[PDB]
Design a protein around this ligand. Structure first.
Ligand SMILES: CC(=O)c1cc[nH]n1
Ligand SMILES: CC(=O)c1cc[nH]n1
Ligand SMILES: CC(=O)c1cc[nH]n1
Ligand SMILES: CC(=O)c1cc[nH]n1
Length: 147
């Protein structure tokens, strides 16, 4: 029917169908468009107190809770989707991963190299698509597939 991971869902507030991807946590009103050995992705990471390494170039000690990190991620998604900001601009300014200095680019990778949730979300994205929140041992990510 739909591309991998995508399902129809019902909007509580509106009563209209929407589309949800349980691999990427993407959601959208529009029916999705239309696997490679490698993908290239950029990401924005928000760390929290339980991150594998709760420290970053932004903050020597990261003290926010997981719930606070998810709210930050949700806010960044809203700003990107509204057109207020672009993905890589927010990654350069606010990502807790050292890749922030390269607009969040992680380069190209195959299956079997990244943390599995990150990998699975990345390979279910099409070029130009963004994930919803992706949870790993590093923290909470949003992912942009660039190639
Ligand atoms: C160990 C734990 O609760 C957690 C939640 C996210 N990352 N780690
Ligand atoms: C799973 C996780 O990190 C989280 C934080 C808030 N809700 N869920
Ligand atoms: C460039 C950018 O912000 C974006 C978000 C989704 N796809 N691209
Ligand atoms: C393995 C690695 O560096 C990774 C996984 C998700 N993000 N970064």
């Amino acid at each position: 029917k739909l591309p991998p991971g995508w399902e129809k869902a019902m909007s509580r507030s509106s009563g209209r169908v929407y589309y949800f991807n349980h691999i990427t946590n993407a959601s959208q009103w529009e029916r999705p468009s239309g696997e490679p050995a490698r993908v290239r992705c950029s990401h924005l990471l928000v760390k929290h107190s339980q991150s594998r390494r709760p420290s970053s170039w932004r903050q020597e000690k990261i003290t926010r809770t997981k719930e606070e990190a998810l709210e930050l991620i949700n806010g960044y998604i809203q700003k990107i989707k509204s057109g207020e900001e672009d993905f890589e601009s927010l990654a350069s300014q606010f990502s807790d991963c050292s890749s922030a200095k390269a607009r969040g680019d992680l380069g190209a990778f195959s299956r079997g190299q990244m943390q599995k949730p990150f990998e699975d979300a990345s390979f279910a994205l099409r070029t130009g698509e963004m994930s919803g929140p992706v949870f790993t041992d590093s923290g909470i990510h949003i992912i942009l597939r660039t190639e």
